[model samples]
Target: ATTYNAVVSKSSSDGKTFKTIADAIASAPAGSTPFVILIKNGVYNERLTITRNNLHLKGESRNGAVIAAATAAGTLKSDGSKWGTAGSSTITISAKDFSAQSLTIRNDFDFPANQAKSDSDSSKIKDTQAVALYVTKSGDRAYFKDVSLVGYQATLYVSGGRSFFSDCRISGTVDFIFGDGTALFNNCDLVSRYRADVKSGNVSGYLTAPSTNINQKYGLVITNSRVIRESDSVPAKSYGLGRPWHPTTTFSDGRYADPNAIGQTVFLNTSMDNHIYGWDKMSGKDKNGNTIWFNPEDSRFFEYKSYGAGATVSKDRRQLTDAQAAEYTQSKVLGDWTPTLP
Candidate 1:
């Protein structure tokens, strides 16, 4: 009857119960036994680092099972070290054949409070990026469904591997769903939250910052998804589809132009709110306060059959032709591995 090999619950009852997610994961025997960890309904505020392969993390319910943490780029641990962007994730999946469903992973960073920091205060800070779900090295062929990722900046960092998200909701402020990974978001909701402070000229925030590798033809691909705004405080024209992220330092040296990490994204048959701007340059300055610019023509960012007040076939927005769009099927994006949704 019971299919799960391990169980995680806040309350102790059964002999197979584990108090924490980490403890349950550690108790699982090694090998490809399809170890499933069924987490009960509760607010699990802990940093989860999953490194084993062939593991499934399933929740009882999407809203009930919440795994959350508040780790920002400026956050210091007990050992007096910064968490940084990658380290400040609520959950990090680092192994292959990993899947999760019916749960919510969030980085509960105080965005409004952090936004109040002035330019001088921002200069003193190292990095304020708060990541909710991070899929890192060797995290290949991962799948997720009926899940939600919430954060402000750099929310879902698919830094490496091939991942698929279906019927999920991801909400954030700036460059939320980003990184140099091959990812496909199918029938999901991409939400851009409201931000009062204007960091750039007129834009409030960017949705994606894809740092795809040079050789990878397929990067971040969104199909049949809806991009919506959180509130009316921020207008619909305040956000951009995405901008190239070099993930560099002062932007003085040749480091700013990361040859290895080129940006690429394509939206196919997606709906959007009026708040999204087409393609735009990244808003930031160099070491000498000189503005940094990214060439849109160089990167492979395109949209096909996108509908909404935000979607347009203009100079700023690049739309793929019907012939070209035919090449972007799920099979081509996911390659040989087929991901099955639960």
Candidate 2:
């Protein structure tokens, strides 16, 4: 049976399987069924890459099994170049049918330690984007439950998949939860972190930045969730709910907004904090370095029954109709397969 599997513990005691998660992962071969790995409670500091399919990681407790690293987008590698936003992740999953339960995946890339400069304005953006969990396009139908993904920016990056996150907590600051996936977040807590040293008043944080493909119908749907903050020190109307991210790509004419990235995002029946104002605008430049603006009016961003002190009915924060809201259920977004517990 798949349940009859390996166990990973930090110390060499009891019926332990491996000292490190990477060793357990390396020992296991691809199985027809899910390869189960029970991780005992401990703090593990490492960069993990899962390339094998059908791997299931079950932690001993919700906050006990901690997997973390300190890689930022600007960190130098062996090649003496930047890791870039895409390469900076604590856990990078590139296989399908991967599931993790009762664990914390984090990228503790301390901005203050690196002496981070403000990338808030001008044409160029800085590279503090650290990803806690990166689910690549090949990592389709991934499932996460009773888990916490913590990072400063670009926390959970899901790329082109039908994924599900049940009762998970994702905490971050700027464009944290992003991607081009048909993903459903059920009863989750989306936290916009408080930064006393950096943000305040009108400029605090951003929750999401979706790069969904044009043909995809659904992308980054958060339902029955709570939009909260780390502390009351974060001023009201300081955070933005989301922004459209049309990643630049090469075209016949020249490089510009990836025409394929027509992102779609919706927040249904959520309680947002007073810190949020509405959706924000993002900018990109063409190959010639000319600025191109993308406004919320032109993006497919909507909300339904988003009741709270922060909520408002404005041009930027469009409300979805009853009929439109009905189409955004978990079943419709996830399609076919339902997530199962271990």
Candidate 3:
């Protein structure tokens, strides 16, 4: 595997003789060589993709190191260029065994200002498919620590994978963490900065629409996670936990619903805010005309040793049995390697 002896500096616009971040990743071979990319504290203001296998990109510091890309698809002009879905993210990593720590990823998609955002801004208005981080197909193991992922369309889209987020902050508007991936979130703070328009009948709440295939047993599972609001003032009413993208049916038509993706979220040993809904219906529906949060008789929604007033559940909100809740402990989800952030 291609390996580097020390931290490499690749600056694109400083006129410094350095390799573009993209090229550096391309130069590396596939293998678990710890291929650590120790990035210094600075706003990269560029797009990056990690396709190599077994890569680890660590930053010097979390608050100081920032990878900021303010461009978007809607605001960008492709110049007749063709690209696929994974290309939509500013920092897209497509390989397995990926780990990151102490870094920030921002898709600076603020439309009002910033000229020549990325070649297509001066001319035609392009759709900013602004995705900060997007994980490709499953089977890969990823760990994000003390990292901040900020964007609009699903800041961290886990379309398919086995990943974990520890002490990370994820902020977004719509189904930010949508996908058929089995993600174990521990000590992570999820803040929903949904567009104001979404509140007005103009939009709805399907914050996460998991499409976990029936074969896959696990989807997005958030354990020991805290759902906080932007304004920590503890509003009287603010946010609903999350909505199921698809609900259950008669198990007919040859298509079996994703057993895990059907809103099987377990908030174990967490402190919730007042805004969290005990249990609510998702605003959207599935192909079978079922509500997204259409919880089944045996739906998987639980909480254990939870604190805060929001943890309270009603008939609509089914509290997990003690035995069932125990199954969600760290040992149950991640086995021996429980994630920890630096």
Candidate 4:
């Protein structure tokens, strides 16, 4: 069997050979065999659309496959009117049954410049809206493994799909993992970068703002996971657990609840640090002048047998019993929905 090579450097520079790859994969003829595009290491500095269904787009290896861009947010300059809602992603995988392993898909946004901009300029121009990977409307069984996502804000966004991640490292400071989907991260390492000051808050701080609605079967469940805070700036520091960023919805009483959101945020068998803003650590006061964290006590937020200096139990932190931990196992929450790897 012969193999088709897709070396970025060797591809047509006139945008002929390179452009054909997208069209060929998207318009693959019917009853045809599955095409595998094995990309070589270097960054492909280009946006790719996986409109073709059931294609195996694998990288050489975890360290070998990298699809990265050095541009900032919305800088791709793509015609948004044509691509669907999530088509604006750098690597948009709308096709169903899409599988990617040992591949590091990233937007490679300028972190240093972003920090400088945040410090120097206080205007709206300071915001950095770079998204590394966005899985919009793919098939239910989307699998990604050993995938390293490095960015400042919203590194990986999965909207409408049942996805799974194994042995993956997701790095970002603020709400790095935010989406409305049924996703699971098993045996993965979630690291928060640039956490220095308890008072100093960067735009990219909070991690995992899961917008999973109450009706959704699965929200963002991090089981057997670990949280690593990277900072020599401060000793024994922490930032946030998870924030309910969902807007307020009205109740049947024709009045809006000051805190109106219900979803499940389970950190099963995990660890924490000092920089964390233990459950509902926001800064809003009620009529009595007592500090109020949005919707402080509505949804189901619990931690079970979490170790490390930051893992302490309190009103917000409920102790998880053996039964509770067993209930949150992979099989119970997302039974038989695991993503297949290459």
Best by TM-score: 2
Per-prediction RMSD in angstroms? 3.1, 3.0, 5.9, 5.5
lDDT per residue, candidate 2, 8-45, as tens digits? 89877656468888888888876646688889999989
Backbone Cα, N, C clashes tallied per candidate: 1, 0, 12, 13
What does the lDDT read for residue 267 in candidate 1? 95
Q: Once model 1 is optimally superposed onto the true structure by TM-score, how far is the C-alpha of residue 331 displaced, in angstroms? A: 0.5
What TM-score, over all chains together, does every model reach? Answer: 0.91, 0.93, 0.75, 0.77
lDDT of 1 at 34: 78
lDDT of 1 at 340: 59
lDDT by residue (30-55, candidate 4, tens digit) is: 53255556555556666777666666
What is candidate 1's local distance difference test score?
Answer: 0.85
lDDT per model vs. reference: 0.85, 0.85, 0.62, 0.63
**Candidate 3 off by > 4 Å:** 1-19, 30-32, 71-86, 111-129, 198-207, 232-236, 246-263, 278-299, 335-342
CA shift of 157, model 4, Å: 1.0
Q: Per-residue lDDT for 78-129 in model 1, tens only?
A: 9988888999999999998889999999999887777677767843444768
| Model 1: per-residue Cα lDDT at residue 85 | 91
Off by over 4 Å in 2: 1-4, 115-126
Poorest lDDT segment (10 consecutive residues) of candidate 1: 249-258
